[PDB]
Amino acid sequence: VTSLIVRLVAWSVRRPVWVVVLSLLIAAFSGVYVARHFKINTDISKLVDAEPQWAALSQAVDRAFPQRNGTILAVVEAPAPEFATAAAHALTESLQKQAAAGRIGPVAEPGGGPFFEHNGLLFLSPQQVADTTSQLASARPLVNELAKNPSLTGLATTLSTTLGQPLLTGQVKLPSMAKLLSRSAATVDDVLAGKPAAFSWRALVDNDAARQPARAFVTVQPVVNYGALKAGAQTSDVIRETARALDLEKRYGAVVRLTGEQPLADDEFSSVEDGAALNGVVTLLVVFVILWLALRSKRMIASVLVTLFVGLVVTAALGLAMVGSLNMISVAFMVLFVGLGVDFSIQYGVKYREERFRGEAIDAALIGAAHSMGMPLALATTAVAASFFSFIPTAYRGVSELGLIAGVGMFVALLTTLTLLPALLRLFAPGFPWLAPVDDYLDRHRKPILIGTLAVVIGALPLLAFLHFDFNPLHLKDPHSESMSTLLALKDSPEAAVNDVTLLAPSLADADAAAKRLDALPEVGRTTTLSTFIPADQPEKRAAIATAASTLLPALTQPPAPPATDAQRVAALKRASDLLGYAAEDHPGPGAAAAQHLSQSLAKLAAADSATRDRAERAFADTLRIALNQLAALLQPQEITRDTLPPPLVRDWVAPDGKALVQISPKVPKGVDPNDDTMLRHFATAVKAAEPGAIGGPISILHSANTIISAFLHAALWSIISITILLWITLRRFGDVLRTLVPLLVSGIVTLEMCVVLGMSLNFANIIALPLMLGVGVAFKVYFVMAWRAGQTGLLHSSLTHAVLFSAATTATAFGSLWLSHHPGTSSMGKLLALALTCTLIGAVVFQPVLM
Amino acid sequence: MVTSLIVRLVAWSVRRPVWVVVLSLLIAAFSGVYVARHFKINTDISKLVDAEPQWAALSQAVDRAFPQRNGTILAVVEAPAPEFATAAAHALTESLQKQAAAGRIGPVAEPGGGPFFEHNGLLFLSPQQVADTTSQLASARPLVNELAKNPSLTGLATTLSTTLGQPLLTGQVKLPSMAKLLSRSAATVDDVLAGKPAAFSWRALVDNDAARQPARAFVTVQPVVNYGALKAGAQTSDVIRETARALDLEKRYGAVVRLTGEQPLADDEFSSVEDGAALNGVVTLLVVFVILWLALRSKRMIASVLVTLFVGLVVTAALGLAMVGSLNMISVAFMVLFVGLGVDFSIQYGVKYREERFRGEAIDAALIGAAHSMGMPLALATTAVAASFFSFIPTAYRGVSELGLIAGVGMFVALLTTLTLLPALLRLFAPGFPWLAPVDDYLDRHRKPILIGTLAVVIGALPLLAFLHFDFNPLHLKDPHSESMSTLLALKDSPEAAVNDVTLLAPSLADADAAAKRLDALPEVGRTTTLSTFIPADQPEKRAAIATAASTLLPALTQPPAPPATDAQRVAALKRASDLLGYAAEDHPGPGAAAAQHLSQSLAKLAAADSATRDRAERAFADTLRIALNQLAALLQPQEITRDTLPPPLVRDWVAPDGKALVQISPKVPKGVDPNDDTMLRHFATAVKAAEPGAIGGPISILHSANTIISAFLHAALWSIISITILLWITLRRFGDVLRTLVPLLVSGIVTLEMCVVLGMSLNFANIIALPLMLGVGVAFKVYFVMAWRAGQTGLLHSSLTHAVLFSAATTATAFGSLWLSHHPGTSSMGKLLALALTCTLIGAVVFQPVLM
Prior knowledge:
Strand content of chain A: under 5%
Oligomer: homodimer
Shape of chain A: elongated
Strand order of the largest sheet of chain A: 2-3-1-4
């Protein structure tokens, strides 16, 4: 091995110009080869390989319902549910205009469109339907005043009316109105504050839930042909354009969000690249300064950098030649190359600079440094390359592609350091007092310090019991990205299919039989099928609805109201405020404290401006005109049979043939947050134990984690075996193999032991750094044992001069570039690599009195 | 020259035995009498774990104000029907009441609901719920009237057959509406036909809110003010088991009484450690005996080691009680540790003498000769193993600070006991393996891979440590099949028992109300109870509504006694109801028709068995109706919500005589999550403790009592090696000999944790004592292994066995097996980790022979 390295350099020194014109030509073809098939792919199912079983179920639900995977989910958020529901209608119509032009796919609001705006009263239970119709029967006089009032002046007139005589008559009571007046006075104070609001008539009567931001969903399914186009900005962009043109949504108080399959998988990649174009170029500067520190020969630094970039282009050229696609995690190889690959040129470049000052000539300096850096560089390279190759045999294409590109990149770095650099180094013709007190302490006391930390690495050994794993990928995919911020927002929403698994069935009768088997499980909870949308006994409900509609609809459709002038408005506000004050003092009670709160607000609102009263009317009246439209539409349902359903509602639940999928939203108790590890694993593992054909959500996430766990466990077992055998081949002394194995063990525990002390959880992308630190762990023992073989009376003195820490400065610079990546998944990987490097560097200086 | 000092003590022991024999035997008599005169076993949970002087103030603040609250054993009276349950509490309560005032036990009461709650129970229902609850009973007046006048089977079957007859045809009553009544009667009727007990419960059918299958009735009794723990009367634990024993009506009421408390739950743990542990102790010696005969095969040698073993053990116990006194649940497990580690020291000396004597020497020269080669070895292993026990002394984990103390003096005795008594004893008296050939040949000729082939895989099994998990709650460590524990693990679902409620104390009732109402703001707090919560809202409007319902319901409830219908009319009234059920199902069909036909089958077959089996269903259907109507009679006359009505004891154990009001906080358990949930109870404890620090009692005490155990466990692991590493420095001054035995410690320390992931072991509290304690055994066996590997460096599987080590481990492994076999996982999992950590130095040393020596 040694002579082969000397021959390969002696040729490079023999024909220097021949190597340069050969390298730049290959550098040209590699640059040509890179651009002609450069591609970045952000598919999320490629970053992990599931077995053919799970692939059949996933494609079964997909090939049957080809749209389900591509359906966008557009959240529309407004301060009031009517303003949200009406904004859904305001936007559902615009997307419909282009769905017919092939611009997008079939648009609908699965939360509940007109089919739910009329028949939503039918989906209720048998008894509480009769209860809801009873309350709407006794409230006939209230809605009779509400459908006729001239809005804010009339709302203040129907207010002042009830506060005057009906309190004296003893019919209406003040404490009962507290629920209305407290929410009325609060909404009035918002308009006086200057911040937007909306008086929700729904949350103050029918709806018990007053959740803060009422939202409305509208889904656009993918275009039929798809395939994307440069001019075809596609369905994610179309929603952006239509809602932009509406502007009405700024008058509705609505914002349009998005999520789905492809917006997040593309947004998470963009989280890695925020700054990465600039974050990587400051690394080259930090490498440069450290590069100049090791070899302060300007005639050398330019030559060292040229070898760095030539091997860098051939890396991507050969990389795209054998993987085809540069995925999300595998794109981080470029940063790892400059950090680890430059080490080959720094370790070799300073020995040449050493030989020149030692007293060698042009021949003897290059081929003489190859005898020092011969099997060392071969050891370090194939050890690091064996670590990247450890994820190759496993079906983890996220790292299997990164290791393949990085592994062959380590051999293209040696071949560049061994030929191109000596050729350039041929054409280009080229004291530490602060370490003194450290080595005096160290060399006089590295006898028990070694025994000291070895006792402490056994002392903190129980800390490994608290070594905790992180299981849900939500933490590492940039939770503040646009698609992940909304995905996490609508987690606690019923029709938001965030956490429900989708089991497929042959027929609808089979799907209903499967739906009952699942509702028997304690964690399953809500399951919906196409038959779930046909209410049990409809004819009985419509009779109670028809009776409630015979007395309400005459009182709901009243003649229009007079546009009240401004003078009547201030009068209606002052006369409603002053009547609220006397109502709270003459009738003292729990609502009296709330009634006086409204008087303070109405009197201030009455004596306020004029623009603030038109806006306040819009927050009180426009919602009331939309709330009454929802009531008149809800009181007129129709028969619902399988053939009386909308066309797309069946297409979403039954494809050609009878294939009916069963979505299973988990039974989430109120305290448990809907996105935890404990219950979603319990749900997904129990509903799968029942029906093995269920995939789609937490079941696919759960099985994807078990694939990654069975991945890095093999790679960590693959590395050592491929490393130990590699060490035994080059160094045949087993006293030299155990010499580089005990430091790996010690350095391996402390990284895990510091994970408990520093309080960091090993997650997914964070755990990739453990198998890699074996090939980098031994590769630094190669550099370190050389800096001390020439002399070891000062371990930190010799380490600087012989340029080993400078080697680490380059590598730590690379690990720090993945640390500052905004994307918390990549930022969690670079944190482990760098912290494990420190536990190896310090570990070496402490643990080399043993193993040298 | 510690070796020369050891010789002075052994050479003196030889030549003159009669001095040694009578000097140590007399001490054993003095030592044995001290053990019998002072043998105090405590069972309090606080003696096993300490806490800050601050947390002991919160514990005693609630205790001094409420002395009774600590030992109020909650006795569950569980019956098939709530009325059979609620009335079974009355039978038990009224009998204990005859001994509460007799001074036999403390004051007796029933928390779930005595007479005060059976009357005012409707006053605690919020204003709107009772408004609809009161109005519903008005429409059931004809129904309850037909039930009050007919508390018999024939009568019940008559009101049954009457409803299915005319009103079912006219549509006055609908058949589907009779779903709960028809389907759950058919279920209860089929139960009586099978022969198994049951009870139609008018509660879960009429009120219909909850149909929980084991109805439970609670009764809390307190302890006597002057608590003396006499023997003429077993304390309140067995008094409830004595009165309700002969009450016998509980076998007729249908309920058994189970008990749980604070002291009766802690003693069930200790008694679980001693299921047959007394037998387990005597069988361990027999196993060590067989190992002793395999080691020094001669009668006079075995009897020598056993006689000196009992002396060192009887003085360890006498010393132990002389400086700790307490011999709690963990401390009592030292004797099995002694028989393992004590015979260990003698196995070395016995077989070294034997070879050295049989190598061509006299007895007197071999006793003093073998003490040379085993001076530093036995001295190192002794203090190094005892330095692991002593690592728990400074920390506040008194369950182990007492065990580590008694075990430390055990090793310092077992050494001295072997060096003097064993030679002088043996001085008074006087006395080939071919199956290792392929195994030793393989390992000896291939130690190049096996060392590297495992040191690699140990590095490859390092990510497994990321899946090592800590079990935080002591409930798993608790013995689950004891009667007191099995009840507390069943009361997770019941709120009035409230097994995990933090108890915050406040100066005044207005202060506690301020603190109790405030705590409700936090999401995990749920229900907080004070005496002001016993004052049911502000409901004279509920007096007006209930009084109106009483004027029409009570006259229909107090009917004249029905003449007991004869037996011949019963088969009539049941066949009349059955054939009517059959018709009512098919001619007027509906969803209830499938159940109406079902009852008809079960009802008809009930009428065709026995006159006794009919009377059997009467005790299930009718005797329940007596109490179901009796419950309603008292429940309709509620009286006032005024503070002064609250009985004397409710004021005593809820507010304080000083005025210190107490808040009990039951966590908001989401209906899906099991109430005894590890993560969310610890979430509830931290939120309550952070908002109001004065809270202690339940989850907070259990949560914090673990944090101090983790701090004591982590210190001992650090304190063990520093004691051991400095000790290795001193004995063997070659640092190449300190690191020689320290690297295999690190290696053997990881492989146990890595196996805890492969095997799947969790690392609880008792499971974790083995981590700091195995640091001594790790360096102690590398002392034993290295001596066997002086003359026989090749064929080391041979040498380790014949030169002492394997018969030594067989005494240690057997000792750890006796801990493994106990019932209490707080002593049965400690034996599993120890034995599994021992196999990583018995194999780890043999594998790492080149690194050792």
